[PDB]
Amino acid sequence: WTNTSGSCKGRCFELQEVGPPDCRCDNLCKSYSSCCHDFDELCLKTARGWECTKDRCGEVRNEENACHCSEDCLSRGDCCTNYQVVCKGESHWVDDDCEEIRVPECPAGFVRPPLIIFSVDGFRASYMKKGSKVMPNIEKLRSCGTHAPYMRPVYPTKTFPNLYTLATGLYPESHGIVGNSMYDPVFDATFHLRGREKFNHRWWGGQPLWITATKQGVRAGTFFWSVSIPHERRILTILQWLSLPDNERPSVYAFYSEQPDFSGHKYGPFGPEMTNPLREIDKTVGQLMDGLKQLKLHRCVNVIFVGDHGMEDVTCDRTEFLSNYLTNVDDITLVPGTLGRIRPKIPNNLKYDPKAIIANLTCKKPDQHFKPYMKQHLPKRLHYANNRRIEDLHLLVERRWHVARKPLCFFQGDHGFDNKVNSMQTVFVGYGPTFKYRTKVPPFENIELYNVMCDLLGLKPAPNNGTHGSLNHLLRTNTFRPTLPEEVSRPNYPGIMYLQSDFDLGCTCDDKSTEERHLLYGRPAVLYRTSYDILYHTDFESGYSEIFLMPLWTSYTISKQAEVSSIPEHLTNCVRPDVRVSPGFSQNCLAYKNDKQMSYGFLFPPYLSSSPEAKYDAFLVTNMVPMYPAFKRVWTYFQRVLVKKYASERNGVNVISGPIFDYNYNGLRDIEDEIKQYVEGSSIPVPTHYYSIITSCLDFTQPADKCDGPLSVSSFILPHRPDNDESCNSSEDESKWVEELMKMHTARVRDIEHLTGLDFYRKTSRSYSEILTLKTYLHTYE
Ligand SMILES: *[C@@H]1O[C@H](CO)[C@@H](O[C@@H]2O[C@H](CO)[C@@H](O[C@@H]3O[C@H](CO[C@H]4O[C@H](CO)[C@@H](O)[C@H](O[C@H]5O[C@H](CO)[C@@H](O)[C@H](O)[C@@H]5O[C@H]5O[C@H](CO)[C@@H](O)[C@H](O)[C@@H]5O)[C@@H]4O)[C@@H](O)[C@H](O)[C@@H]3O)[C@H](O)[C@H]2NC(C)=O)[C@H](O)[C@H]1NC(C)=O
Ligand SMILES: *[C@@H]1O[C@H](CO)[C@@H](O[C@@H]2O[C@H](CO)[C@@H](O)[C@H](O)[C@H]2NC(C)=O)[C@H](O)[C@H]1NC(C)=O
Numbered sequence: 001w002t003n004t005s006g007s008c009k010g011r012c013f014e015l016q017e018v019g020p021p022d023c024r025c026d027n028l029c030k031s032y033s034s035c036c037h038d039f040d041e042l043c044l045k046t047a048r049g050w051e052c053t054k055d056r057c058g059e060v061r062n063e064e065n066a067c068h069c070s071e072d073c074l075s076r077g078d079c080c081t082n083y084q085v086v087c088k089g090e091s092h093w094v095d096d097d098c099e100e101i102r103v104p105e106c107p108a109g110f111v112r113p114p115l116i117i118f119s120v121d122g123f124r125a126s127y128m129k130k131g132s133k134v135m136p137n138i139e140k141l142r143s144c145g146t147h148a149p150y151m152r153p154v155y156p157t158k159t160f161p162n163l164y165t166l167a168t169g170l171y172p173e174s175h176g177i178v179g180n181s182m183y184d185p186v187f188d189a190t191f192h193l194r195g196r197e198k199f200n201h202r203w204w205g206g207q208p209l210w211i212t213a214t215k216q217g218v219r220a221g222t223f224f225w226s227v228s229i230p231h232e233r234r235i236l237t238i239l240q241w242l243s244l245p246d247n248e249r250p251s252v253y254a255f256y257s258e259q260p261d262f263s264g265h266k267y268g269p270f271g272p273e274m275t276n277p278l279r280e281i282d283k284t285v286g287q288l289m290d291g292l293k294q295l296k297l298h299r300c301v302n303v304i305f306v307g308d309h310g311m312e313d314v315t316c317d318r319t320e321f322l323s324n325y326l327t328n329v330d331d332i333t334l335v336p337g338t339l340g341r342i343r344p345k346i347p348n349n350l351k352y353d354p355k356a357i358i359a360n361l362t363c364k365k366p367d368q369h370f371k372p373y374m375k376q377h378l379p380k381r382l383h384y385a386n387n388r389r390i391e392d393l394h395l396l397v398e399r400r401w402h403v404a405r406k407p408l409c410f411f412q413g414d415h416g417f418d419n420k421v422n423s424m425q426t427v428f429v430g431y432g433p434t435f436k437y438r439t440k441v442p443p444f445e446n447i448e449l450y451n452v453m454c455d456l457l458g459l460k461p462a463p464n465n466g467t468h469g470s471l472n473h474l475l476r477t478n479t480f481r482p483t484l485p486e487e488v489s490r491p492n493y494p495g496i497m498y499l500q501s502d503f504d505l506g507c508t509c510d511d512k513s514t515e516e517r518h519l520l521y522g523r524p525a526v527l528y529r530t531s532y533d534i535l536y537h538t539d540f541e542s543g544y545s546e547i548f549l550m551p552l553w554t555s556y557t558i559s560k561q562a563e564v565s566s567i568p569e570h571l572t573n574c575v576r577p578d579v580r581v582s583p584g585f586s587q588n589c590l591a592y593k594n595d596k597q598m599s600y601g602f603l604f605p606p607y608l609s610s611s612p613e614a615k616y617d618a619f620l621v622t623n624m625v626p627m628y629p630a631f632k633r634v635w636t637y638f639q640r641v642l643v644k645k646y647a648s649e650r651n652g653v654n655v656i657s658g659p660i661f662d663y664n665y666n667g668l669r670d671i672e673d674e675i676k677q678y679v680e681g682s683s684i685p686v687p688t689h690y691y692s693i694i695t696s697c698l699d700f701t702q703p704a705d706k707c708d709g710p711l712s713v714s715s716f717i718l719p720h721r722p723d724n725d726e727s728c729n730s731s732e733d734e735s736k737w738v739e740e741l742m743k744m745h746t747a748r749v750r751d752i753e754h755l756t757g758l759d760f761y762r763k764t765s766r767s768y769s770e771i772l773t774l775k776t777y778l779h780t781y782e
């Protein structure tokens with residue numbers, strides 16, 4: 001029980017924690033119905049609006065007014081933000097020429113630059129092109145500070161998952177806020193954007209910035225604002241807090257606007273009606289900047305202007321209904337819209353038939369505007385599976401569409417789609433002494449920002465999914481010096497030790513400076529305990545695992561001119577034992593011969609052999625991996641057609657390929673115990689995915705093997721599945737569907753590192769920070 005009889009006199013937006021029975025006056029009291037009886041009266045004044053006018057200048061102080069224009073207002077820290085312009089002949093900040101801020105220019109008593117996070121909801125990256133004609137304050141921040149052309153949100157691209165990802169550096173599957181709405185089967189409770197359940201702390205995992213700050217003795221302003229508090233009051237509050245005594249002043253502040261999201265939903269992102277909302281946000285940024293200038297802080301504070309996601313054209317006319325595919329939709333609950341998550345209406349309903357549901361949802365219309373996935377089958381780049389609140393059955397919805405349960409307008413915009421979709425991209429600008437001046441940086445992911453905000457505040461980040469150092473290039477100072485991870489397992493280098501006669505594997509082969517060329521960036525470091533051999537070959541090198549009975553990685557270079565050679569008919573089934581590696585640490589062809597479902601393939605493709613001679617190396621048992629025929633359709637097309645196409649287009653390519661084991665879909669290398677499938681009658685483990693990392697010279701005029709500067713990389717993590725049900729056109733020639741599949745399963749090198757325990761690019765001519773940026777790159781194909 002809270003005693004509302006108390007008073008917020010001299011307590012408005014106090015920062016001290018106050019629990020029952022005492023009543024509160026903080027920004028969040030209204031949400032807890034714990035405000036004192038005079039909160040709204042004392043703390044939420046509106047009298048005379050938010051702007052000084054000439055007739056108010058040097059007024060006598062009336063405490064009833066929203067903000068003040070009296071002579072004392074400055075030292076009391078509560079002038080209207082435009083007070084000096086109107087009353088003292090100063091200029092608005094926006095009208096001042098930009099000037100490099102080489103070091104913080106902070107008043108007496110400031111030990112470090114404060115950080116202000118200005119978050120805007122549904123701010124599509126492309127809105128920035130509207131420029132100073134619509135958003136002059138924001139355009140000044142953008143042009144004079146550090147900006148990216150866009151920032152990638154996390155999936156699903158909705159507000160709660162993204163704001164909490166911004167605060168924690170975590171994927172939703174890790175922080176727990178996996179949607180704006182979710183059901184937790186253990187709590188047997190439901191979380192909604194609106195309603196009180198979300199206030200319960202059990203939902204929120206990881207360690208958000210305000211807690212990290214507090215635990216390290218850095219004070220934080222509020223990172224929540226009650227919907228009922230006007231933006232102007234939020235801004236005045238921040239400025240008032242910045243005017244507090246040195247021993248009370250917070251170091252980090254957050255402002256949030258629910259625009260332009262609201263207007264985007266109503267009108268769509270290209271509506272002329274979007275101009276007004278964007279002007280209003282800009283006016284708010286100007287209030288803040290004018291306010292800071294009034295306080296002599298405008299060259300002291302670091303400002304981050306950042307969105308949570310974008311906005312797409314989505315109308316009533318573009319809605320798929322499950323009732324068109326399924327007989328009884330009244331027995332399922334659907335989290336609907338720009339994504340789908342399906343569970344039985346009655347929790348744990350035993351008659352729930354997921355395999356039958358998925359079958360009825362797979363490739364049933366030619367123009368079908370969604371695709372069902374069991375969550376372990378979603379592209380690994382989404383990192384959307386390892387949480388009990390994520391339903392097994394997911395629908396990935398096509399951009400511009402909605403999915404609804406049944407048929408049983410006022411909206412022209414929505415968001416939530418796949419986070420590589422252009423319309424979902426959002427904004428990032430950093431401005432202030434710690435950011436660079438007039439600098440553009442490539443797009444990056446929002447999971448990276450937590451580390452950077454920690455850097456900006458002198459904090460040590462809690463464990464998270466950013467790659468610390470990958471954004472060092474945004475900063476003038478306060479960069480993080482990353483350290484190379486230490487290798488855990490050194491390789492063996494086996495020479496010949498056996499005779500062809502030593503081998504009884506069931507394999508038949510009818511007819512009978514490698515590094516320099518093939519490990520352009522050094523051998524990958526193995527970061528776990530295991531046993532593996534380096535193997536050299538004319539055309540490729542590999543780290544062959546004696547535990548998993550196949551390479552952890554296979555590395556090879558293909559020059560622009562390389563010749564694609566066929567596999568001779570007599571070599572079709574050719575598999576040759578490898579006299580460097582024990583029969584006991586080898587696969588055997590008998591397992592394949594007998595497994596009626598599983599075939600095999602090669603990591604180094606015989607099609608790219610450097611001579612009919614060398615091609616015999618490609619058929620070694622130590623180059624072979626278990627592949628379903630369905631997967632082989634993809635992999636052969638890749639090996640035979642695509643690698644050469646890339647070599648041709650990029651002036652040669654360096655390729656590293658290998659298996660991934662992630663049976664528990666946690667995005668991390670499986671230990672032996674977690675692997676759940678083996679080739680029939682054997683102990684050959686079956687990968688859940690195969691990866692390829694394709695590197696070349698950023699300057700395409702230089703060949704990959706003779707690159708002097710920055711690198712270019714694209715990579716994939718392809719699902720190893722027994723059918724091609726994912727690809728609706730797979731009945732056609734591979735040229736009609738394989739690349740489309742591959743694009744959906746594009747990945748970062750960093751993703752592959754998590755999934756393999758390998759560390760790549762350890763020997764290059766670039767800085768470690770640059771390499772970290774390279775490893776976080778995602779080739780989107782948009
Ligand atoms: C993205 O970055 C994160 C953070 O580093 C990585 O997530 C970590 O993975 C490691 C290795 O698997 C886990 O280690 C285990 O920790 C548990 C004990 O963990 C408890 O205590 C820690 C520390 O206080 C706490 O962070 C954990 O929080 C988890 O569980 C909470 C209660 O259910 C929950 O509220 C919170 O959201 C979080 O859930 C997530 O993780 C759990 C697994 O712990 C997972 O089941 C769930 O679905 C969510 O994904 C927890 O209270 C030990 O007992 C084990 O032995 C082992 O040490 C970390 O727990 C985990 N950290 C977090 C915060 O998720 C990701 O791997 C990384 N992803 C990628 C792809 O790189
Ligand atoms: C709820 O808060 C009110 C206001 O603080 C408390 O009222 C005070 O109670 C004391 C006696 O306990 C009186 O001497 C004061 O005059 C009261 N203040 C006013 C202005 O009313 C009240 O006690 C609280 N209720 C509780 C403690 O249950």
Ligand SMILES: *[C@@H]1O[C@H](CO)[C@@H](O[C@@H]2O[C@H](CO)[C@@H](O)[C@H](O)[C@H]2NC(C)=O)[C@H](O)[C@H]1NC(C)=O
Nearest residue numbers: 325326327328329353355356357358359360361
């Ligand atoms: C999957 O779709 C098929 C239709 O293609 C559904 O088949 C119907 O099944 C009902 C009872 O199950 C029969 O009365 C109808 O004759 C079938 N319809 C047609 C047009 O053939 C099937 O029910 C669907 N399954 C699920 C789980 O929704």
Ligand SMILES: CCCCCCCCCCCCCC(=O)OC[C@@H](O)COP(=O)(O)O
Nearest residue numbers: 119158159163166167223224225254256258
């Ligand atoms: C690094 C700090 C990051 C976080 C700053 C957080 C500020 C939070 C203020 C409280 C939450 C406001 C949430 C909100 O107002 O949602 C509005 C909804 O219509 C959004 O729905 P949707 O995703 O657009 O469909």
Ligand SMILES: [Ca+2]
Nearest residue numbers: 662668669670
């Ligand atoms: Ca795993």
Ligand SMILES: [K+]
Nearest residue numbers: 592595598599
């Ligand atoms: K077979």
Ligand code: NA
Nearest residue numbers: 724725727730
């Ligand atoms: Na198919």
Ligand SMILES: [Zn+2]
Nearest residue numbers: 121122159308
């Ligand atoms: Zn939002």
Ligand SMILES: [Zn+2]
Nearest residue numbers: 122261265415
């Ligand atoms: Zn929205």
